[model samples]
Target chain A: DKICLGHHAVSNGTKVDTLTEKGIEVVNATETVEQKNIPKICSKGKQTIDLGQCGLLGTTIGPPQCDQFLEFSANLIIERREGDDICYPGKFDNEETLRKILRKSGGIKKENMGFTYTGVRTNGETSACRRSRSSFYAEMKWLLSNTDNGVFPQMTKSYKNTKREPALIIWGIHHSGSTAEQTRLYGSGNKLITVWSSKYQQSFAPSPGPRPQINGQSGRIDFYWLMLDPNDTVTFSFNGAFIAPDRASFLRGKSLGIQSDAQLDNNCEGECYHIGGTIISNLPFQNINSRAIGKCPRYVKQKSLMLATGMKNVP
Target chain B: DKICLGHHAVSNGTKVDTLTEKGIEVVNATETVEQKNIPKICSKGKQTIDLGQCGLLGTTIGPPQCDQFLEFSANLIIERREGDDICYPGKFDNEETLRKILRKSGGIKKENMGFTYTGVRTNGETSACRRSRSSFYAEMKWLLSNTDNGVFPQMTKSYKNTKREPALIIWGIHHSGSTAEQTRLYGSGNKLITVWSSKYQQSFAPSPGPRPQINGQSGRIDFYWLMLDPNDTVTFSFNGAFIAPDRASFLRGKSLGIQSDAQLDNNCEGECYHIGGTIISNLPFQNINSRAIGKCPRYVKQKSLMLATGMKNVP
Candidate 1:
């Protein structure tokens, strides 16, 4: 299949634009044959957007960081109880906390998950990673464990906790493990090793259309990009050199990981918000490189600096 | 306000960046000015998206464009219905002329404002513009209209006719009357424009924000770009500056005129095929002086290209 360099492939001076598949065209600044030299003229398809723009992609999952959940609490609050000195906004109240509060207020236990906060995670960068795991991450992992298997509301369908695992927008990599868990949280599931691993993987972001690996390479680890949560909890962007996290890079650290749906479903539930650091990212990265590395002899062949076009569903 | 450049901004060797909104550091290849240029070492934000990666604030409203509508219809089965043979694929009980077919099939009648076939009175650029109007352009427009109004049964909503109109992507003076069209398309309601224009009218495609016309520059002729009905019976790639339509530059022996969308909505029901040839382009633009003017000083003042960084709510 041809590379879909996207609407701005031309303007970005991307090299994949060499082929004009469908409506796309390849416009080099200087219509010369400089395979090695950087592109002078680039072409693109058009404009587009990602999850954040929608402003509804992220959601504060659980405790700790959920200080935000309090902001919108009144909308979901039930009633204060006996042991309810501590009360804040959220989708619902805690069992013990609510039970005590209800007792004092002569009310029944607060509706569970009723006001459990649900909204896209905040976008600004934070040092929150230095903090421990939040409840949302814990739940996210639980949800992943039930991969392949569709999710049901912890409370009701009206409030279904159906968040598919996040995706990191990975571009081309000469060599790397495609399936290794960099974040470590993504340990299992249908490990789509890219190169067209499977014809059918019931997911919008499911499996890539890739060719078979030469010796026996895992597709996932090969291309190391950041996958964001459906709630826009994270954003992984790369510039001229597929660089690191920005000040918001802390969010990247406060990050979690999960495995492919297949593995998650087949195994126990997946885990979320496993806070390891660059070590986790390095673990798989290093392991994958040891196996084999697809040399970008033509660095241009390595999908040009894939600036984040934002989290979009390409599959 | 940031300087919006295209994919060549930062990568172009300029030290462009922002310091206004302290917490965040949003960057775009669309050239921008940096607080300070660090000529020596590589200094990019921790998080960065490749040229085609990032998305805009409320993307999908007004993206980018390549060319006009209809000509992009190369993908559709455009049956030129004549009085003798107006046979559409799905519905046609009795034979009807082109006018009759639109009347019944397209709901174009007295109440709907009966339409005409233009009967060769057009400049003939429609088809050419349609064909050259890149798919990226059309798709973005579709999304823009959809984002603003139409529902995507696939995503969060149901389907129905949308509530958007042509938007103001940018404001530039044209070298010819084409610019006149651009200048006028900016107008709205009671003589209202399309549903999209409302949002588009308010949309600022360039950063440092394109200045509002303070003086009586009303007569300034700038070409207006809008996404007409691509599904009305067409698809597209981009403007065919690189390609040429089969027909003569002028079409059907008539010149294509830029009529008010009100005129279009009233006279033609906003559903006409793009006549090929005759339309001008600015790609590797053959004629910059002839009707197809390039950039302007004021146009350069804003961060226009970087604006493309974010995607929108286009259909």
Candidate 2:
């Protein structure tokens, strides 16, 4: 009755385990969510996490056949680190931006989509929990491992948000060549990176690029900027917080919105969770305490759970 | 370099589920945590659960057995509720005040000096989390079941700071008159409602009761008034959050504490995991901007690895 249940004799114990009761779960096709008792007040001020180091602990093990030299001449697809590995969902906002970045002179080739979209497994599917990201991670890996190892190419893919919902940068992680091999057995190769078509505008950003139908897909596909040597490993990421509001359009089915300020810093606007909150549902119907002033609860819970383990080679 | 990977020349190329990358993996475990992103801030206000609705829902399910009943107790344990079933910590200020209270009453009962101890399976195994006060939900259940079901009463215990923390409430559940069975079999039976013993001028809350000796088993037992009774159910609840400053030395465990108008009026000191929350720590580490705030990362990860999906039935 006091601070905590100070003893251990209560019976019919419920151990915390998988399917650990989450928000209000309803018997609906779309898993229902109704949770309670979250603190609505902060000590004051905001919480922060910097970019970079947004990577799961991964290793190259030993240098293998991988693409080297790459120039980000054309559509350089920018991305975030979401899955365990394999970058997917390039950085640009749409197809035109992707093409303009990919079609640059002395630009990289389109082959690097392997690197850009190599979004680690996100290889969702399998498991009742609906793990799609993991599947994406796995698929990307298959593409990279099968190629002649290393590959560096330009991009011309304009990554556009199907829904006009502004793309949020919630968070990004890029360790400048942190995982690169010091030297390849094949002798020499140029390190790859997404570059501005014009050397003068080298900063990475998303934009509209020429619509190119990749593999002849019926829909018009825009160019995204991504320069990676198929021979080398690449990492790029982005999350659902930027996807459809309730996540109707995820490459994966689960839609746990991971949010951050940098992602919000971008002009992309909408609702975010916790901070940069994704959705603004409603206020407490009753019990309106200090939170009436607007604040989040004390201890927060995570959304659409990640792999639950550190990013593994699985993604 | 095409729009969509022409996996299905005509049908999406077999949906690309090749068996090539199965038993092999190339992953690095040294990748540091990705960059921290901005903390998603949620409004604490929007996170309140309608205790009334929840209670109504409970009615729909019919009175649950001991197990579901206790689980529901945890959910219902809040500072104050409106029309019952309303949802749901503590800090003792002084040492001498605590000691005097304890002297007036039996010292706190502690088993192995553990806070947030469990009353079920008291063999000193499967301790519940005590970071907060919800532990009593189960503590009460364990008490009723043990008194009724004949389970072990190996006392689980705790103090404030594990280092030199004073006696906090032990995981005890008690009421006067009809014994724990009153609340167990019938909601609000003849209850001292305060002191479990026949002593006068000594009762939980509003007054100090004759603290009994720390039961080698239940440890320091406490008592409180019944707060709610499920429709037609034999169980009742007490105001756990409103107990006294939680004086230790109550023999083993107890249910007595100070009640403040500020707390009772605006009352909301122990609600855990509510709605719009900026910080979520299910895994212990912080994830505001993909950044983990603290040691909870390792803790959460470790806990996840050990999670099982099977159910252990108990009557």
Candidate 3:
């Protein structure tokens, strides 16, 4: 089976010279590149592309006649700024500025997305970012929910150079209970990093009155990271539990929900009880494909990442 | 009025040459010196001397028949050791070891006493003293209670040379309540310092059972420091409120209780209530006499002490 570019019917055996004249590079179709680095090819001004048996390719450029699987790779860049950073304090005051930057970066549309972060920048020697961890979680929630408006909005022309970098602020969340158990993870810049989990529980007790009572409540917010391989295959697990993905099903870039749902217990009725209260757990990312360029390196694993970030012990 | 040594009669106009033959120096009686630095003069081996009209002096020699007020100056030295100090971990394990060192210094006896401390000593660059503040209060409590056994025990003969320094471990106490209000003070070495206060409140509710009920609990533990001047005059206040002392009453070396009372409330019967919960306040030392050599300098006050200890703001 061969991959087809949008409406343009280009097969695996198609001549490279033909596509080159149309401003398309005919390198190895299997070559993996950052989603933002991908070139525009669709003449109708569509920003969607596909990765199939012909490997990665751009949109249609010739005749609008091709039937193939359409896949979009969502690439995201997250940045952390210390309290003393020159551009801080008011730089992140509005979400419009961030959305404008991400839209111009040709990544993070309403499809399959992946995230990465940059090192921290500070104004001086002391890199003290006030409430940095809290900011990370808040930014992540904003990025996930604000995707309806198209993180990468519709461009004016079919082909335009990718403008600003797609980035967000990343922070690690430290959760603890009465007995004082906690877990934390950080990026290379000694700043917290991880995606928010979408799992939670709720309980409600309904009485004869108009308002229902909340008798019991419980939930879990698993902090995790999603690791994507060069082939766009990904693997993630909660609480350090590893699960090898099915190579066939995880191919061609997949979209996974990274939203946390902590709603009021409206469904429970009459004497609702929960075993354990709210809990926090960490989920580490793993890349099984060793040969992939974007494979999860050993140094980036939980233990190594913790040590790299100067954690005295592995959580 | 004149100061008569144990037996030798010495008046204000007595010739210096007469006392020189008996191994006693005839310096101005008004000159003040550390108690441990005083020379031995009583031939009968009594370690008691009075500061009367003759000011400060040692014991008597020759004849053993004279009537004059006898005064004994009590001086104490305290030391603080960081966790990384070479002599720590086990050096302060036993009370006997500290007691022996104090007895030989001729400073802390069963009577009048004053305290001072040396700078902290650490093993290396990082001066991290674990629980140094806690150790200070514990050592102070021990010093006050152990005086009954004679902190400076009875000497072997007329007098032997003062051996090791009379020093104890000093620490500062940090106290706080629910709303998170706290106060801290430290010495020059960045280690906590201050004498313990004896003020405390306790209450009990007696029932028809063997063990009484501790229904309501409340008290105040005021951490304070006692400042003594060169003339042996002293002044102290609680919660930064200064109170000048009566010059005559506070003269001639006075003994004050530095013990805290946190005993069980054994007197109350049924329904005991306290207005305020347990409280902690800081009492700073103030030396009123500006001319005295040992007078408390302004730099050592609460505000200056906090700044010297690297506190961002004074408590």
Q: What is the CAPRI rating of model 3's predicted complex?
A: incorrect
Where model 3 places Cα greater than 4 Å from the true spot, the runs are: A1-229, A237-315, B1-315
Chain A TM-score of model 1 comes to: 0.17
Per-candidate DockQ values are: 0.01, 0.01, 0.01
Rank the candidate models, highest TM-score first. 1, 2, 3
Query: Residue A37 CA error for candidate 3 (Å)?
Result: 36
Residue B191 CA error for candidate 2 (Å)? Answer: 82
- The local lDDT score (0 to 100) that residue B79 gets in candidate 2 is 18
The sequence of per-residue lDDT tens digits that candidate 1 reaches over residues A134-244 is 222111212121222222112111122124433222222211122232112223333222211112111112221212232232221111223234444332211111111
The CA lDDT at B71 in model 3 is 18
Residue A247, candidate 3: C-alpha displacement in angstroms: 15
What class would a CAPRI assessor give candidate 1's docking? incorrect
Worst 10 residues of 1 chain B by lDDT: B242-251
Clashes of 2: 199
